């Protein structure tokens, strides 16, 4: 049954075995209808915790590559060994991105009807193109950024239908700014988009915020940390 697959996903998550969680989620993605809220969150959790370690690794390997490069007598072999090892990870990242990006385009985005879903999936789309754009350079990058920007702009248009303090609406704005700052290098443009989103949450802070208090109040805090980080530069 569905609920048993949900239970299995939750068990995989409980055990921190995400690679399987991806599969036990796909098995529910095969089933009828749109994914639930609970079922959506699990999807994001699985894929985030799969891509995360590789993203972390990529950065360390990248720092070590630069560190190795920047020396009086660069060892030619170690740069080779490192390059290949980065490129081994980049592939895992590519595969993990294509896997989900495919399912968003083919399965999830067309199936959706309510807004909160549409914004969740369109945000997600943005995120994985953004993760692809972290290691790409030059022109591949430019085309990926294009694919992100449209997903984020799709998410953004529809997010206007959600309350200012919806964790999806905030979560979006947070990531959309990060996209601008980190991929497109537009500090003003990211600050605008963050600040604008934060302030709208502050106006609606008094306004009912209830079960989203944990999830919203966090993202509000993250927007600020970013705003402080980017302002001071």
């Amino acid at each position: 049954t569905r609920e048993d697959y949900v239970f299995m996903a939750q068990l995989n998550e409980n055990a921190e075995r995400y690679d399987e969680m991806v599969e036990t989620m796909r098995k529910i993605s095969g089933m009828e209808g749109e994914l639930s809220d609970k079922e959506r969150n699990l999807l994001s959790v699985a894929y985030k915790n799969v891509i995360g370690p590789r993203r972390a690794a990529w950065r360390i390997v990248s720092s070590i590559e630069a560190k190795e490069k920047g020396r009086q007598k660069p060892n030619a072999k170690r740069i080779e060994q490192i390059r290949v090892y980065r490129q081994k990870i980049e592939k895992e990242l590519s595969d993990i991105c294509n896997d989900i990006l495919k399912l968003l385009q083919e399965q999830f985005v067309p199936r959706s009807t309510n807004a909160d879903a549409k914004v969740f999936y369109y945000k997600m789309q943005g995120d994985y193109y953004r993760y692809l754009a972290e290691y790409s350079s030059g022109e591949d990058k430019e085309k990926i950024a294009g694919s992100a920007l449209n997903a984020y702009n799709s998410a953004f248009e529809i997010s206007q239908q959600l309350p200012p303090t919806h964790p999806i609406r905030l979560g979006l704005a947070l990531n959309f700014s990060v996209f601008y700052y980190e991929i497109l290098a537009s500090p003003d443009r990211a600050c605008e988009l963050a600040r604008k989103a934060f302030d709208a949450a502050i106006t609606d802070l008094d306004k009912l915020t209830e079960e989203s208090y944990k999830d919203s109040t966090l993202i509000m805090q993250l927007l600020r940390d970013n705003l402080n980080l980017w302002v001071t530069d």
């Binding site: 985030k48 995120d127 905030l170 979006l172 947070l174 990531n175 990060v178 966090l218 993250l222």
Partner: peptide, 4 residues
């Protein structure tokens, strides 16, 4: 950071 980005959203959880």
């Amino acid at each position: 950071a980005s959203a959880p």
